[PDB]
Amino acid sequence: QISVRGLAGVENVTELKKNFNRHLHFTLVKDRNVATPRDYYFALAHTVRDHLVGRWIRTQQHYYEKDPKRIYYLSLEFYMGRTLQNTMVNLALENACDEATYQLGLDMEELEEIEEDAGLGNGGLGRLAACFLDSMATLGLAAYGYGIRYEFGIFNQKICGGWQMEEADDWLRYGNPWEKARPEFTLPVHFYGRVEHTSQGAKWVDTQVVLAMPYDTPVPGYRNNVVNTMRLWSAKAPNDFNLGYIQAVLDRNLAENISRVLYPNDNFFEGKELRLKQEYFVVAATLQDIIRRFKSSTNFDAFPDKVAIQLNDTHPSLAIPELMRVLVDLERLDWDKAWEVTVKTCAYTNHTVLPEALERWPVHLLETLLPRHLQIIYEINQRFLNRVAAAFPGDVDRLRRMSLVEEGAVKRINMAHLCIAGSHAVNGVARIHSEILKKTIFKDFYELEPHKFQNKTNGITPRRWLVLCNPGLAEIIAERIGEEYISDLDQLRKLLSYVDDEAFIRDVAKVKQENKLKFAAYLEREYKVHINPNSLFDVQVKRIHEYKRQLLNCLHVITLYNRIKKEPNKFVVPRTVMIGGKAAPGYHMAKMIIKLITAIGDVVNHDPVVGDRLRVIFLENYRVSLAEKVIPAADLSEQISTAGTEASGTGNMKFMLNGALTIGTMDGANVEMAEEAGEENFFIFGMRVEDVDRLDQRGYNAQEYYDRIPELRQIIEQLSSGFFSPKQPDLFKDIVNMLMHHDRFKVFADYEEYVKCQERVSALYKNPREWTRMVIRNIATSGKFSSDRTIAQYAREIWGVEPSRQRLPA
Ligand SMILES: Cc1nnc([C@@H]2O[C@H](CO)[C@@H](O)[C@H](O)[C@H]2O)o1
Numbered sequence: 001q002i003s004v005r006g007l008a009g010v011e012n013v014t015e016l017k018k019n020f021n022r023h024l025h026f027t028l029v030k031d032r033n034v035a036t037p038r039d040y041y042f043a044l045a046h047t048v049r050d051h052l053v054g055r056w057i058r059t060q061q062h063y064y065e066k067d068p069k070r071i072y073y074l075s076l077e078f079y080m081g082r083t084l085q086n087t088m089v090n091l092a093l094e095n096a097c098d099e100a101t102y103q104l105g106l107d108m109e110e111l112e113e114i115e116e117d118a119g120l121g122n123g124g125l126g127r128l129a130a131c132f133l134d135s136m137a138t139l140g141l142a143a144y145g146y147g148i149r150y151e152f153g154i155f156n157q158k159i160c161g162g163w164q165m166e167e168a169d170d171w172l173r174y175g176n177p178w179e180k181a182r183p184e185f186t187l188p189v190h191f192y193g194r195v196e197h198t199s200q201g202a203k204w205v206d207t208q209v210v211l212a213m214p215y216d217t218p219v220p221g222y223r224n225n226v227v228n229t230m231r232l233w234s235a236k237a238p239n240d241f242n243l244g245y246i247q248a249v250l251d252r253n254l255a256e257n258i259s260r261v262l263y264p265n266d267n268f269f270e271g272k273e274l275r276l277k278q279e280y281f282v283v284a285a286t287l288q289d290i291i292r293r294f295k296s297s298t299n300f301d302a303f304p305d306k307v308a309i310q311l312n313d314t315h316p317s318l319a320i321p322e323l324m325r326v327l328v329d330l331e332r333l334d335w336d337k338a339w340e341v342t343v344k345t346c347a348y349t350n351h352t353v354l355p356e357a358l359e360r361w362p363v364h365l366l367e368t369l370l371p372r373h374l375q376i377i378y379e380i381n382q383r384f385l386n387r388v389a390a391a392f393p394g395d396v397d398r399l400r401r402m403s404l405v406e407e408g409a410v411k412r413i414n415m416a417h418l419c420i421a422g423s424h425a426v427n428g429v430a431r432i433h434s435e436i437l438k439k440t441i442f443k444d445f446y447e448l449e450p451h452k453f454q455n456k457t458n459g460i461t462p463r464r465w466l467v468l469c470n471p472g473l474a475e476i477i478a479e480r481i482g483e484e485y486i487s488d489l490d491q492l493r494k495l496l497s498y499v500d501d502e503a504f505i506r507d508v509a510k511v512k513q514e515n516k517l518k519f520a521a522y523l524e525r526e527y528k529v530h531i532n533p534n535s536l537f538d539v540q541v542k543r544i545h546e547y548k549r550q551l552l553n554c555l556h557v558i559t560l561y562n563r564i565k566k567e568p569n570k571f572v573v574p575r576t577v578m579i580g581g582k583a584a585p586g587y588h589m590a591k592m593i594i595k596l597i598t599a600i601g602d603v604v605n606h607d608p609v610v611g612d613r614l615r616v617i618f619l620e621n622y623r624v625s626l627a628e629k630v631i632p633a634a635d636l637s638e639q640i641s642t643a644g645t646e647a648s649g650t651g652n653m654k655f656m657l658n659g660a661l662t663i664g665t666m667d668g669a670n671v672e673m674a675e676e677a678g679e680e681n682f683f684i685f686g687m688r689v690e691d692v693d694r695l696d697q698r699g700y701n702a703q704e705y706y707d708r709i710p711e712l713r714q715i716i717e718q719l720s721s722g723f724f725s726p727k728q729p730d731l732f733k734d735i736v737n738m739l740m741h742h743d744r745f746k747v748f749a750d751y752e753e754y755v756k757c758q759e760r761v762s763a764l765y766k767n768p769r770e771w772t773r774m775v776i777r778n779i780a781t782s783g784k785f786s787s788d789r790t791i792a793q794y795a796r797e798i799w800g801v802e803p804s805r806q807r808l809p810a
């Protein structure tokens with residue numbers, strides 16, 4: 001069909017067809033008379049899977065032979081999404097499989113929709129890990145992703161009566177064809193117990209044991225025949241466990257609950273024991289696996305030369321004291337030597353500055369669950385503070401500020417401080433974020449060890465986020481500049497010479513229109529809700545959170561509605577405002593925000609006077625698979641977090657690469673995106689970080705904005721009086737009270753500039769040609785945001801390895 005999808009050779013289509021029938025028969029045990037679409041999906045999955053194994057085996061054999069430095073990316077989250085299409089794309093099998101299934105009388109797109117999203121993540125943090133694995137494989141790095149195989153991933157969101165309802169994500173229900181259980185590599189993980197101090201060394205004894213069983217999933221690079229591994233651990237109780245008889249067997253669930261479910265929190269720390277167990281579980285099993293692999297390559301001096309461990313935030317921070325524990329207690333290395341090795345091996349990536357998201361574990365918890373680790377942490381702290389005291393003599397406050405141990409109500413361990421002390425590199429995820437780290441929360445550490453601090457601006461993989469979700473766009477681009485850009489996104493700059501090309505302008509606009517039509521259709525198919533494909537698609541999809549300010553968007557929507565009601569027969573650019581995202585189950589305000597959005601839709605979407613000029617839709621169950629559908633269809637990307645709160649953001653990059661213009665604050669990567677495309681091609685508004693600080697020094701008083709802005713006042717009064725909740729007049733009292741008295745994110749402060757900016761957006765949309773030309777300028781300069789660039793920087797500046805675009809013989 002289209003170029004970028006590979007060749008549909010005669011021999012290969014024939015081979016695919018026979019292997020498809022072979023799996024349907026032998027693997028699924030079905031014939032064409034009783035097979036269902038799901039059976040066909042699996043038949044296709046196994047067929048595509050077969051093409052991976054050969055490459056997977058030799059890639060691993062290759063690393064064994066050449067023994068390069070290994071990169072271990074530790075994360076409690078890997079938001080992978082679907083695997084079928086991504087695998088076909090990276091193996092250049094998409095057209096062949098499309099043809100083969102066509103000849104078999106099947107629609108491949110229909111089959112792809114059957115695959116369950118592997119939702120082992122909450123949002124940006126987990127998705128970043130997924131994009132990183134894709135880039136590391138594409139850049140030929142000997143990398144391994146290590147995490148937990150949650151039985152239940154992020155919950156499926158159902159909207160009932162306008163409220164979010166959560167239901168278990170039983171993603172393994174029908175089986176997972178992509179994983180390979182490796183029970184032979186099961187490892188023991190210890191919990192509780194006590195520490196015994198003997199003649200030579202301390203011993204951790206009387207522990208409870210939980211087995212870690214690994215499941216391997218292949219990670220194919222883009223057309224380079226490299227297939228890396230993502231190893232996820234599953235909790236298994238030993239067989240002598242708790243060994244009435246029946247109860248003992250049933251209680252095995254206690255130990256196995258460790259890998260049962262993903263904590264559904266995005267940017268929020270919840271200090272629960274189960275979560276701590278998950279964090280240690282992944283770290284303990286992973287480190288043993290890493291050391292075992294290292295030994296089969298005594299000389300731990302070379303350990304840092306053959307191993308790099310990247311900590312995705314502080315979630316796997318226990319890797320530092322666990323590594324020390326193994327080297328000191330088990331390998332018998334002297335402390336100083338063990339510490340040198342640990343520091344040179346570990347690197348830490350910070351993803352937030354929000355106080356409520358930073359991990360601070362109560363000492364009593366570590367004391368009971370991991371007694372030896374607590375002792376090691378105290379020793380690390382003692383030695384670290386001695387270094388601080390020597391560098392800043394007499395500065396007693398600095399000592400207490402930098403301590404890994406926080407005193408107060410209950411003593412806690414600041415995991416971020418632990419990570420900085422035990423890592424040779426600490427990085428932020430966007431230029432502004434990394435600067436904020438050095439100027440604020442990590443200022444003391446930066447002054448002590450400036451060399452440790454770096455920046456690694458985030459990125460997204462252009463395979464899943466362009467070729468896979470937007471083939472139409474990838475095609476018209478390839479038509480002009482070739483396919484090389486798919487693994488070298490910087491080449492998109494060549495599109496700048498087509499900004500005045502009438503044919504290209506027309507094609508770019510055509511692709512967007514087609515995507516919108518397709519999405520508008522999908523909305524009626526699976527969700528039954530009519531929308532106007534000719535309107536501007538204004539979308540804000542991301543987790544629901546106060547700092548992301550979906551509320552600011554809500555205020556704008558109500559403003560638009562009130563303006564139409566005031567002057568009904570006045571022309572306004574038609575808009576379809578789409579907001580989607582999940583709220584953490586225990587985050588009350590976030591759940592109230594979802595209700596507000598649907599409530600607004602209830603009024604706006606049924607007002608005769610508004611007509612098809614304004615529609616407000618809440619996109620249910622936003623997840624990776626849905627992102628692949630809505631992002632290509634978007635015209636306007638809402639990235640409106642309060643300046644200084646969104647460390648980077650990555651959804652912003654996805655929209656830019658897919659032809660949407662951006663309206664946003666100078667926050668996270670938005671700053672670099674605007675810098676790359678040129679501020680004139682971006683819709684920037686609101687306070688800058690400096691303005692926010694000025695407001696805080698003076699004191700934020702929302703009442704002031706309410707008193708000076710009539711339109712804002714009207715909105716608040718509508719919310720308070722029950723205009724959007726007739727049967728329950730005070731339903732949104734908590735929202736109004738927060739907005740008026742304790743809004744940490746200054747929604748009102750950016751209201752005026754936001755509305756004004758939105759007017760300039762509508763003005764430009766009225767001029768199709770100029771809107772598209774600005775779009776081209778954005779797409780053409782989105783190259784810097786490829787995770788290939790991000791990974792290449794991590795590789796060279798942190799891991800000490802060189803990326804390679806060399807194909808392996810297939
Ligand atoms: C903590 C934490 N939890 N989620 C995040 C997210 O991680 C993403 C990838 O770096 C960033 O782009 C987001 O701004 C950050 O909020 O940080």
Ligand SMILES: *Cc1c(COP(=O)(O)O)cnc(C)c1O
Nearest residue numbers: 123124542623624627649650651
């Ligand atoms: C990319 C992505 C995110 C991150 O979006 P931001 O707007 O940066 O918060 C979250 N969820 C999903 C499903 C994504 O694909």
